[PDB]
């Protein structure tokens, strides 16, 4: 929920936090780029074996 903060529990004091949307959106977009690259490796090797339509067959 709605507690956006860091508590200095060295001092045991709450400190409310504005999570920066610039940091948030750049973070999720570049993590989307990292998942884009993992799905890149996924689709490259997966289609290099299965655009062939060749698999671990019955024998």
């Amino acid at each position: 929920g709605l507690i956006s903060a860091r508590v200095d529990s060295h001092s045991k004091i709450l400190y409310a936090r504005d999570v920066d949307q610039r940091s948030t959106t750049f973070e999720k977009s570049l993590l989307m780029g990292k998942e884009f690259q993992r799905r890149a490796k996924a689709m490259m090797l997966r289609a290099a074996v299965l655009r062939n339509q060749i698999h671990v067959k019955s024998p």
Binding site: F26, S29, L30, G33
Partner: protein, 169 residues
Amino acid sequence: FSFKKLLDQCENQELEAPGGIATPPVYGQLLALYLLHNDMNNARYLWKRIPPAIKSANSELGGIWSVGQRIWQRDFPGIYTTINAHQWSETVQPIMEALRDATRRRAFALVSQAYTSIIADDFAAFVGLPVEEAVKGILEQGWQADSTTRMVLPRKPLARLTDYVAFLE
């Protein structure tokens, strides 16, 4: 380093021709490039494929392997106490000292970032240099001294948004 090419040519001499036959200086270059890398995962596979004869014959490398276990487990006074007990014939032993200096400066740059405060006696035992030599080194590179705490405070020494909007935005 050049031990990469040395290891490649010694594996041309060891992993190509001889019979499944083992060779100890090739294995010395192997544990040299597994302790410079500190790749004790693959140096475990080394230690699985080192013969116990070569564990007993290339055995200055065995003391090197023990000291590298103390490095991997980060047993720092046991590291710097056991410097001159192993001396293998110029494959690992000079770069044992070079790796000691690399790990010295590595612990230096590591504590410089990862510590708001370290015990300087630990850190001197972590780098092998003594305590006031570590004081001279941190005044050389720029940490914050904190007397009477004995906790020296470590310290590390346009078209931008155009490209950022152009790809990520």
